[PDB]
Amino acid sequence: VAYKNLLQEIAQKESSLLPFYATATSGPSHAPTFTSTVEFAGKVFSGEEAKTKKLAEMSAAKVAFMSIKNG
């Protein structure tokens, strides 16, 4: 599955702005790192630092999903 799809579903139903994914690149040429951050419902959830985009994006959707649960 892909919590990404569900996140979009609620966006329309809730009437919220369709979530948007973003990634940033920064760090030493020897020790690079990327952080994926998602924005929705007028809120921004920061993911977990990692040396990969796959994990970064996952961390963002992971924390976001957990937060959406509490409301």
JSON list of N, CA and C in Angstrom, two decimals:
[
{"chain": "A", "resi": 1, "resn": "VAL", "atom": "N", "xyz": [0.86, -1.22, 0.00]},
{"chain": "A", "resi": 1, "resn": "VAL", "atom": "CA", "xyz": [0.00, 0.00, 0.00]},
{"chain": "A", "resi": 1, "resn": "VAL", "atom": "C", "xyz": [0.88, 1.24, 0.00]},
{"chain": "A", "resi": 2, "resn": "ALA", "atom": "N", "xyz": [0.25, 2.41, 0.08]},
{"chain": "A", "resi": 2, "resn": "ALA", "atom": "CA", "xyz": [0.98, 3.67, 0.08]},
{"chain": "A", "resi": 2, "resn": "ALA", "atom": "C", "xyz": [0.19, 4.75, 0.80]},
{"chain": "A", "resi": 3, "resn": "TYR", "atom": "N", "xyz": [0.48, 4.95, 2.08]},
{"chain": "A", "resi": 3, "resn": "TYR", "atom": "CA", "xyz": [-0.21, 5.96, 2.87]},
{"chain": "A", "resi": 3, "resn": "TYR", "atom": "C", "xyz": [-0.31, 7.27, 2.09]},
{"chain": "A", "resi": 4, "resn": "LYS", "atom": "N", "xyz": [0.49, 7.39, 1.04]},
{"chain": "A", "resi": 4, "resn": "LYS", "atom": "CA", "xyz": [0.47, 8.59, 0.21]},
{"chain": "A", "resi": 4, "resn": "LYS", "atom": "C", "xyz": [-0.89, 8.73, -0.48]},
{"chain": "A", "resi": 5, "resn": "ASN", "atom": "N", "xyz": [-1.43, 7.61, -0.94]},
{"chain": "A", "resi": 5, "resn": "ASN", "atom": "CA", "xyz": [-2.72, 7.63, -1.63]},
{"chain": "A", "resi": 5, "resn": "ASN", "atom": "C", "xyz": [-3.83, 8.03, -0.66]},
{"chain": "A", "resi": 6, "resn": "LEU", "atom": "N", "xyz": [-3.84, 7.41, 0.51]},
{"chain": "A", "resi": 6, "resn": "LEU", "atom": "CA", "xyz": [-4.86, 7.70, 1.51]},
{"chain": "A", "resi": 6, "resn": "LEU", "atom": "C", "xyz": [-4.80, 9.17, 1.93]},
{"chain": "A", "resi": 7, "resn": "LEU", "atom": "N", "xyz": [-3.58, 9.67, 2.11]},
{"chain": "A", "resi": 7, "resn": "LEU", "atom": "CA", "xyz": [-3.40, 11.06, 2.52]},
{"chain": "A", "resi": 7, "resn": "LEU", "atom": "C", "xyz": [-4.10, 11.99, 1.54]},
{"chain": "A", "resi": 8, "resn": "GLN", "atom": "N", "xyz": [-4.05, 11.64, 0.26]},
{"chain": "A", "resi": 8, "resn": "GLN", "atom": "CA", "xyz": [-4.69, 12.46, -0.76]},
{"chain": "A", "resi": 8, "resn": "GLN", "atom": "C", "xyz": [-6.21, 12.34, -0.67]},
{"chain": "A", "resi": 9, "resn": "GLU", "atom": "N", "xyz": [-6.69, 11.14, -0.34]},
{"chain": "A", "resi": 9, "resn": "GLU", "atom": "CA", "xyz": [-8.12, 10.91, -0.23]},
{"chain": "A", "resi": 9, "resn": "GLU", "atom": "C", "xyz": [-8.75, 11.81, 0.81]},
{"chain": "A", "resi": 10, "resn": "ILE", "atom": "N", "xyz": [-8.14, 11.85, 1.99]},
{"chain": "A", "resi": 10, "resn": "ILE", "atom": "CA", "xyz": [-8.64, 12.69, 3.08]},
{"chain": "A", "resi": 10, "resn": "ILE", "atom": "C", "xyz": [-8.55, 14.16, 2.70]},
{"chain": "A", "resi": 11, "resn": "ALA", "atom": "N", "xyz": [-7.53, 14.50, 1.92]},
{"chain": "A", "resi": 11, "resn": "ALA", "atom": "CA", "xyz": [-7.34, 15.89, 1.51]},
{"chain": "A", "resi": 11, "resn": "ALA", "atom": "C", "xyz": [-8.60, 16.41, 0.83]},
{"chain": "A", "resi": 12, "resn": "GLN", "atom": "N", "xyz": [-9.11, 15.65, -0.13]},
{"chain": "A", "resi": 12, "resn": "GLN", "atom": "CA", "xyz": [-10.30, 16.05, -0.85]},
{"chain": "A", "resi": 12, "resn": "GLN", "atom": "C", "xyz": [-11.52, 16.05, 0.06]},
{"chain": "A", "resi": 13, "resn": "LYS", "atom": "N", "xyz": [-11.71, 14.95, 0.79]},
{"chain": "A", "resi": 13, "resn": "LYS", "atom": "CA", "xyz": [-12.85, 14.83, 1.69]},
{"chain": "A", "resi": 13, "resn": "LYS", "atom": "C", "xyz": [-12.83, 15.95, 2.72]},
{"chain": "A", "resi": 14, "resn": "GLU", "atom": "N", "xyz": [-11.69, 16.12, 3.38]},
{"chain": "A", "resi": 14, "resn": "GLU", "atom": "CA", "xyz": [-11.55, 17.16, 4.40]},
{"chain": "A", "resi": 14, "resn": "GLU", "atom": "C", "xyz": [-11.55, 18.54, 3.75]},
{"chain": "A", "resi": 15, "resn": "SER", "atom": "N", "xyz": [-11.34, 18.57, 2.44]},
{"chain": "A", "resi": 15, "resn": "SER", "atom": "CA", "xyz": [-11.31, 19.83, 1.71]},
{"chain": "A", "resi": 15, "resn": "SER", "atom": "C", "xyz": [-9.96, 20.52, 1.90]},
{"chain": "A", "resi": 16, "resn": "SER", "atom": "N", "xyz": [-9.01, 19.80, 2.48]},
{"chain": "A", "resi": 16, "resn": "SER", "atom": "CA", "xyz": [-7.68, 20.36, 2.71]},
{"chain": "A", "resi": 16, "resn": "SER", "atom": "C", "xyz": [-6.86, 20.36, 1.42]},
{"chain": "A", "resi": 17, "resn": "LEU", "atom": "N", "xyz": [-5.79, 21.14, 1.41]},
{"chain": "A", "resi": 17, "resn": "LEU", "atom": "CA", "xyz": [-4.94, 21.22, 0.23]},
{"chain": "A", "resi": 17, "resn": "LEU", "atom": "C", "xyz": [-4.17, 19.93, 0.03]},
{"chain": "A", "resi": 18, "resn": "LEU", "atom": "N", "xyz": [-4.27, 19.37, -1.18]},
{"chain": "A", "resi": 18, "resn": "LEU", "atom": "CA", "xyz": [-3.58, 18.13, -1.50]},
{"chain": "A", "resi": 18, "resn": "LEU", "atom": "C", "xyz": [-2.13, 18.18, -1.00]},
{"chain": "A", "resi": 19, "resn": "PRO", "atom": "N", "xyz": [-1.76, 17.27, -0.14]},
{"chain": "A", "resi": 19, "resn": "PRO", "atom": "CA", "xyz": [-0.39, 17.19, 0.42]},
{"chain": "A", "resi": 19, "resn": "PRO", "atom": "C", "xyz": [0.69, 17.25, -0.65]},
{"chain": "A", "resi": 20, "resn": "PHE", "atom": "N", "xyz": [1.85, 17.81, -0.29]},
{"chain": "A", "resi": 20, "resn": "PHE", "atom": "CA", "xyz": [2.96, 17.94, -1.25]},
{"chain": "A", "resi": 20, "resn": "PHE", "atom": "C", "xyz": [4.26, 17.42, -0.63]},
{"chain": "A", "resi": 21, "resn": "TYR", "atom": "N", "xyz": [5.00, 16.61, -1.39]},
{"chain": "A", "resi": 21, "resn": "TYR", "atom": "CA", "xyz": [6.25, 16.06, -0.88]},
{"chain": "A", "resi": 21, "resn": "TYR", "atom": "C", "xyz": [7.44, 16.88, -1.34]},
{"chain": "A", "resi": 22, "resn": "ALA", "atom": "N", "xyz": [8.45, 17.01, -0.47]},
{"chain": "A", "resi": 22, "resn": "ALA", "atom": "CA", "xyz": [9.64, 17.79, -0.81]},
{"chain": "A", "resi": 22, "resn": "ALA", "atom": "C", "xyz": [10.88, 17.19, -0.17]},
{"chain": "A", "resi": 23, "resn": "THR", "atom": "N", "xyz": [12.02, 17.32, -0.85]},
{"chain": "A", "resi": 23, "resn": "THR", "atom": "CA", "xyz": [13.27, 16.79, -0.33]},
{"chain": "A", "resi": 23, "resn": "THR", "atom": "C", "xyz": [14.38, 17.82, -0.46]},
{"chain": "A", "resi": 24, "resn": "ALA", "atom": "N", "xyz": [15.27, 17.87, 0.53]},
{"chain": "A", "resi": 24, "resn": "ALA", "atom": "CA", "xyz": [16.38, 18.82, 0.51]},
{"chain": "A", "resi": 24, "resn": "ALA", "atom": "C", "xyz": [17.71, 18.09, 0.55]},
{"chain": "A", "resi": 25, "resn": "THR", "atom": "N", "xyz": [18.71, 18.65, -0.11]},
{"chain": "A", "resi": 25, "resn": "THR", "atom": "CA", "xyz": [20.04, 18.04, -0.14]},
{"chain": "A", "resi": 25, "resn": "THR", "atom": "C", "xyz": [21.05, 18.94, 0.56]},
{"chain": "A", "resi": 26, "resn": "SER", "atom": "N", "xyz": [21.78, 18.38, 1.52]},
{"chain": "A", "resi": 26, "resn": "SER", "atom": "CA", "xyz": [22.78, 19.14, 2.26]},
{"chain": "A", "resi": 26, "resn": "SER", "atom": "C", "xyz": [23.70, 18.20, 3.03]},
{"chain": "A", "resi": 27, "resn": "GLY", "atom": "N", "xyz": [24.90, 18.67, 3.33]},
{"chain": "A", "resi": 27, "resn": "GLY", "atom": "CA", "xyz": [25.87, 17.86, 4.07]},
{"chain": "A", "resi": 27, "resn": "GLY", "atom": "C", "xyz": [27.21, 17.80, 3.35]},
{"chain": "A", "resi": 28, "resn": "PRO", "atom": "N", "xyz": [28.22, 17.35, 4.03]},
{"chain": "A", "resi": 28, "resn": "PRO", "atom": "CA", "xyz": [29.59, 17.23, 3.45]},
{"chain": "A", "resi": 28, "resn": "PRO", "atom": "C", "xyz": [29.64, 16.27, 2.27]},
{"chain": "A", "resi": 29, "resn": "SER", "atom": "N", "xyz": [30.59, 16.49, 1.36]},
{"chain": "A", "resi": 29, "resn": "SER", "atom": "CA", "xyz": [30.73, 15.63, 0.20]},
{"chain": "A", "resi": 29, "resn": "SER", "atom": "C", "xyz": [31.12, 14.22, 0.62]},
{"chain": "A", "resi": 30, "resn": "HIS", "atom": "N", "xyz": [31.64, 14.10, 1.84]},
{"chain": "A", "resi": 30, "resn": "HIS", "atom": "CA", "xyz": [32.04, 12.80, 2.37]},
{"chain": "A", "resi": 30, "resn": "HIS", "atom": "C", "xyz": [30.88, 12.14, 3.10]},
{"chain": "A", "resi": 31, "resn": "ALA", "atom": "N", "xyz": [30.11, 12.95, 3.83]},
{"chain": "A", "resi": 31, "resn": "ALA", "atom": "CA", "xyz": [28.96, 12.44, 4.57]},
{"chain": "A", "resi": 31, "resn": "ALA", "atom": "C", "xyz": [27.70, 13.21, 4.18]},
{"chain": "A", "resi": 32, "resn": "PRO", "atom": "N", "xyz": [27.12, 12.89, 3.06]},
{"chain": "A", "resi": 32, "resn": "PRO", "atom": "CA", "xyz": [25.89, 13.55, 2.57]},
{"chain": "A", "resi": 32, "resn": "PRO", "atom": "C", "xyz": [24.64, 13.07, 3.31]},
{"chain": "A", "resi": 33, "resn": "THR", "atom": "N", "xyz": [23.59, 13.89, 3.28]},
{"chain": "A", "resi": 33, "resn": "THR", "atom": "CA", "xyz": [22.35, 13.53, 3.95]},
{"chain": "A", "resi": 33, "resn": "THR", "atom": "C", "xyz": [21.18, 14.28, 3.32]},
{"chain": "A", "resi": 34, "resn": "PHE", "atom": "N", "xyz": [19.99, 13.67, 3.38]},
{"chain": "A", "resi": 34, "resn": "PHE", "atom": "CA", "xyz": [18.80, 14.29, 2.81]},
{"chain": "A", "resi": 34, "resn": "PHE", "atom": "C", "xyz": [17.64, 14.19, 3.78]},
{"chain": "A", "resi": 35, "resn": "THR", "atom": "N", "xyz": [16.77, 15.20, 3.76]},
{"chain": "A", "resi": 35, "resn": "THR", "atom": "CA", "xyz": [15.61, 15.22, 4.64]},
{"chain": "A", "resi": 35, "resn": "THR", "atom": "C", "xyz": [14.35, 15.51, 3.83]},
{"chain": "A", "resi": 36, "resn": "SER", "atom": "N", "xyz": [13.36, 14.63, 3.95]},
{"chain": "A", "resi": 36, "resn": "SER", "atom": "CA", "xyz": [12.10, 14.80, 3.23]},
{"chain": "A", "resi": 36, "resn": "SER", "atom": "C", "xyz": [11.05, 15.37, 4.15]},
{"chain": "A", "resi": 37, "resn": "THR", "atom": "N", "xyz": [10.44, 16.48, 3.73]},
{"chain": "A", "resi": 37, "resn": "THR", "atom": "CA", "xyz": [9.41, 17.13, 4.53]},
{"chain": "A", "resi": 37, "resn": "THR", "atom": "C", "xyz": [8.11, 17.25, 3.75]},
{"chain": "A", "resi": 38, "resn": "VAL", "atom": "N", "xyz": [7.00, 16.95, 4.41]},
{"chain": "A", "resi": 38, "resn": "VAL", "atom": "CA", "xyz": [5.69, 17.03, 3.76]},
{"chain": "A", "resi": 38, "resn": "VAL", "atom": "C", "xyz": [4.84, 18.11, 4.40]},
{"chain": "A", "resi": 39, "resn": "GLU", "atom": "N", "xyz": [3.99, 18.74, 3.60]},
{"chain": "A", "resi": 39, "resn": "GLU", "atom": "CA", "xyz": [3.12, 19.80, 4.10]},
{"chain": "A", "resi": 39, "resn": "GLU", "atom": "C", "xyz": [1.67, 19.52, 3.74]},
{"chain": "A", "resi": 40, "resn": "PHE", "atom": "N", "xyz": [0.78, 19.69, 4.72]},
{"chain": "A", "resi": 40, "resn": "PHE", "atom": "CA", "xyz": [-0.64, 19.46, 4.49]},
{"chain": "A", "resi": 40, "resn": "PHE", "atom": "C", "xyz": [-1.46, 20.01, 5.65]},
{"chain": "A", "resi": 41, "resn": "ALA", "atom": "N", "xyz": [-2.74, 20.24, 5.41]},
{"chain": "A", "resi": 41, "resn": "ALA", "atom": "CA", "xyz": [-3.62, 20.76, 6.45]},
{"chain": "A", "resi": 41, "resn": "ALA", "atom": "C", "xyz": [-3.05, 22.04, 7.05]},
{"chain": "A", "resi": 42, "resn": "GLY", "atom": "N", "xyz": [-2.16, 22.68, 6.31]},
{"chain": "A", "resi": 42, "resn": "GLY", "atom": "CA", "xyz": [-1.54, 23.92, 6.78]},
{"chain": "A", "resi": 42, "resn": "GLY", "atom": "C", "xyz": [-0.48, 23.62, 7.83]},
{"chain": "A", "resi": 43, "resn": "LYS", "atom": "N", "xyz": [0.03, 22.40, 7.82]},
{"chain": "A", "resi": 43, "resn": "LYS", "atom": "CA", "xyz": [1.06, 21.99, 8.78]},
{"chain": "A", "resi": 43, "resn": "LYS", "atom": "C", "xyz": [2.20, 21.30, 8.07]},
{"chain": "A", "resi": 44, "resn": "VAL", "atom": "N", "xyz": [3.40, 21.38, 8.65]},
{"chain": "A", "resi": 44, "resn": "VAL", "atom": "CA", "xyz": [4.57, 20.75, 8.06]},
{"chain": "A", "resi": 44, "resn": "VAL", "atom": "C", "xyz": [5.17, 19.73, 9.01]},
{"chain": "A", "resi": 45, "resn": "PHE", "atom": "N", "xyz": [5.35, 18.51, 8.52]},
{"chain": "A", "resi": 45, "resn": "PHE", "atom": "CA", "xyz": [5.92, 17.44, 9.34]},
{"chain": "A", "resi": 45, "resn": "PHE", "atom": "C", "xyz": [7.31, 17.08, 8.82]},
{"chain": "A", "resi": 46, "resn": "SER", "atom": "N", "xyz": [8.31, 17.23, 9.67]},
{"chain": "A", "resi": 46, "resn": "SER", "atom": "CA", "xyz": [9.68, 16.92, 9.29]},
{"chain": "A", "resi": 46, "resn": "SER", "atom": "C", "xyz": [9.96, 15.43, 9.45]},
{"chain": "A", "resi": 47, "resn": "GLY", "atom": "N", "xyz": [10.65, 14.85, 8.47]},
{"chain": "A", "resi": 47, "resn": "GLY", "atom": "CA", "xyz": [10.97, 13.43, 8.51]},
{"chain": "A", "resi": 47, "resn": "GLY", "atom": "C", "xyz": [12.24, 13.20, 9.32]},
{"chain": "A", "resi": 48, "resn": "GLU", "atom": "N", "xyz": [12.77, 11.98, 9.24]},
{"chain": "A", "resi": 48, "resn": "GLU", "atom": "CA", "xyz": [13.98, 11.64, 9.97]},
{"chain": "A", "resi": 48, "resn": "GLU", "atom": "C", "xyz": [15.20, 11.72, 9.06]},
{"chain": "A", "resi": 49, "resn": "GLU", "atom": "N", "xyz": [16.25, 12.37, 9.54]},
{"chain": "A", "resi": 49, "resn": "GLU", "atom": "CA", "xyz": [17.48, 12.50, 8.76]},
{"chain": "A", "resi": 49, "resn": "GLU", "atom": "C", "xyz": [17.97, 11.12, 8.32]},
{"chain": "A", "resi": 50, "resn": "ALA", "atom": "N", "xyz": [18.54, 11.06, 7.13]},
{"chain": "A", "resi": 50, "resn": "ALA", "atom": "CA", "xyz": [19.04, 9.80, 6.60]},
{"chain": "A", "resi": 50, "resn": "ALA", "atom": "C", "xyz": [19.87, 10.04, 5.34]},
{"chain": "A", "resi": 51, "resn": "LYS", "atom": "N", "xyz": [20.71, 9.08, 4.99]},
{"chain": "A", "resi": 51, "resn": "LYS", "atom": "CA", "xyz": [21.55, 9.19, 3.80]},
{"chain": "A", "resi": 51, "resn": "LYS", "atom": "C", "xyz": [20.84, 8.61, 2.59]},
{"chain": "A", "resi": 52, "resn": "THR", "atom": "N", "xyz": [19.52, 8.74, 2.55]},
{"chain": "A", "resi": 52, "resn": "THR", "atom": "CA", "xyz": [18.73, 8.21, 1.44]},
{"chain": "A", "resi": 52, "resn": "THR", "atom": "C", "xyz": [17.39, 8.93, 1.34]},
{"chain": "A", "resi": 53, "resn": "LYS", "atom": "N", "xyz": [16.87, 9.04, 0.13]},
{"chain": "A", "resi": 53, "resn": "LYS", "atom": "CA", "xyz": [15.59, 9.70, -0.09]},
{"chain": "A", "resi": 53, "resn": "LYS", "atom": "C", "xyz": [14.43, 8.77, 0.24]},
{"chain": "A", "resi": 54, "resn": "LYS", "atom": "N", "xyz": [14.63, 7.47, 0.01]},
{"chain": "A", "resi": 54, "resn": "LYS", "atom": "CA", "xyz": [13.58, 6.50, 0.28]},
{"chain": "A", "resi": 54, "resn": "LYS", "atom": "C", "xyz": [13.16, 6.53, 1.74]},
{"chain": "A", "resi": 55, "resn": "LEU", "atom": "N", "xyz": [14.13, 6.41, 2.63]},
{"chain": "A", "resi": 55, "resn": "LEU", "atom": "CA", "xyz": [13.85, 6.43, 4.06]},
{"chain": "A", "resi": 55, "resn": "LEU", "atom": "C", "xyz": [13.31, 7.79, 4.50]},
{"chain": "A", "resi": 56, "resn": "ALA", "atom": "N", "xyz": [13.89, 8.85, 3.95]},
{"chain": "A", "resi": 56, "resn": "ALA", "atom": "CA", "xyz": [13.46, 10.20, 4.31]},
{"chain": "A", "resi": 56, "resn": "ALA", "atom": "C", "xyz": [11.97, 10.37, 4.05]},
{"chain": "A", "resi": 57, "resn": "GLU", "atom": "N", "xyz": [11.55, 10.09, 2.83]},
{"chain": "A", "resi": 57, "resn": "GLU", "atom": "CA", "xyz": [10.14, 10.22, 2.47]},
{"chain": "A", "resi": 57, "resn": "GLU", "atom": "C", "xyz": [9.27, 9.35, 3.37]},
{"chain": "A", "resi": 58, "resn": "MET", "atom": "N", "xyz": [9.76, 8.15, 3.67]},
{"chain": "A", "resi": 58, "resn": "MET", "atom": "CA", "xyz": [9.01, 7.23, 4.52]},
{"chain": "A", "resi": 58, "resn": "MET", "atom": "C", "xyz": [8.84, 7.80, 5.92]},
{"chain": "A", "resi": 59, "resn": "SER", "atom": "N", "xyz": [9.90, 8.41, 6.43]},
{"chain": "A", "resi": 59, "resn": "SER", "atom": "CA", "xyz": [9.85, 8.99, 7.77]},
{"chain": "A", "resi": 59, "resn": "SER", "atom": "C", "xyz": [8.84, 10.13, 7.83]},
{"chain": "A", "resi": 60, "resn": "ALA", "atom": "N", "xyz": [8.75, 10.88, 6.75]},
{"chain": "A", "resi": 60, "resn": "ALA", "atom": "CA", "xyz": [7.81, 12.00, 6.68]},
{"chain": "A", "resi": 60, "resn": "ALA", "atom": "C", "xyz": [6.37, 11.51, 6.70]},
{"chain": "A", "resi": 61, "resn": "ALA", "atom": "N", "xyz": [6.09, 10.51, 5.87]},
{"chain": "A", "resi": 61, "resn": "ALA", "atom": "CA", "xyz": [4.74, 9.95, 5.80]},
{"chain": "A", "resi": 61, "resn": "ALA", "atom": "C", "xyz": [4.41, 9.15, 7.05]},
{"chain": "A", "resi": 62, "resn": "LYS", "atom": "N", "xyz": [5.45, 8.65, 7.71]},
{"chain": "A", "resi": 62, "resn": "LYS", "atom": "CA", "xyz": [5.26, 7.87, 8.93]},
{"chain": "A", "resi": 62, "resn": "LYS", "atom": "C", "xyz": [4.81, 8.76, 10.09]},
{"chain": "A", "resi": 63, "resn": "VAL", "atom": "N", "xyz": [5.52, 9.86, 10.29]},
{"chain": "A", "resi": 63, "resn": "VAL", "atom": "CA", "xyz": [5.19, 10.79, 11.36]},
{"chain": "A", "resi": 63, "resn": "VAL", "atom": "C", "xyz": [3.88, 11.50, 11.09]},
{"chain": "A", "resi": 64, "resn": "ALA", "atom": "N", "xyz": [3.67, 11.86, 9.83]},
{"chain": "A", "resi": 64, "resn": "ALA", "atom": "CA", "xyz": [2.45, 12.56, 9.44]},
{"chain": "A", "resi": 64, "resn": "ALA", "atom": "C", "xyz": [1.22, 11.69, 9.69]},
{"chain": "A", "resi": 65, "resn": "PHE", "atom": "N", "xyz": [1.30, 10.43, 9.28]},
{"chain": "A", "resi": 65, "resn": "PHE", "atom": "CA", "xyz": [0.18, 9.51, 9.46]},
{"chain": "A", "resi": 65, "resn": "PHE", "atom": "C", "xyz": [-0.14, 9.36, 10.94]},
{"chain": "A", "resi": 66, "resn": "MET", "atom": "N", "xyz": [0.89, 9.26, 11.76]},
{"chain": "A", "resi": 66, "resn": "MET", "atom": "CA", "xyz": [0.70, 9.10, 13.20]},
{"chain": "A", "resi": 66, "resn": "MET", "atom": "C", "xyz": [-0.01, 10.32, 13.79]},
{"chain": "A", "resi": 67, "resn": "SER", "atom": "N", "xyz": [0.36, 11.50, 13.31]},
{"chain": "A", "resi": 67, "resn": "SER", "atom": "CA", "xyz": [-0.24, 12.73, 13.80]},
{"chain": "A", "resi": 67, "resn": "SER", "atom": "C", "xyz": [-1.71, 12.83, 13.38]},
{"chain": "A", "resi": 68, "resn": "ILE", "atom": "N", "xyz": [-1.98, 12.49, 12.13]},
{"chain": "A", "resi": 68, "resn": "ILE", "atom": "CA", "xyz": [-3.34, 12.56, 11.61]},
{"chain": "A", "resi": 68, "resn": "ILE", "atom": "C", "xyz": [-4.28, 11.70, 12.45]},
{"chain": "A", "resi": 69, "resn": "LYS", "atom": "N", "xyz": [-3.74, 10.64, 13.03]},
{"chain": "A", "resi": 69, "resn": "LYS", "atom": "CA", "xyz": [-4.54, 9.75, 13.86]},
{"chain": "A", "resi": 69, "resn": "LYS", "atom": "C", "xyz": [-5.09, 10.49, 15.07]},
{"chain": "A", "resi": 70, "resn": "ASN", "atom": "N", "xyz": [-4.26, 11.33, 15.68]},
{"chain": "A", "resi": 70, "resn": "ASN", "atom": "CA", "xyz": [-4.67, 12.09, 16.85]},
{"chain": "A", "resi": 70, "resn": "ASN", "atom": "C", "xyz": [-5.37, 13.38, 16.43]},
{"chain": "A", "resi": 71, "resn": "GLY", "atom": "N", "xyz": [-6.68, 13.43, 16.62]},
{"chain": "A", "resi": 71, "resn": "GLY", "atom": "CA", "xyz": [-7.46, 14.61, 16.26]},
{"chain": "A", "resi": 71, "resn": "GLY", "atom": "C", "xyz": [-8.94, 14.40, 16.56]}
]
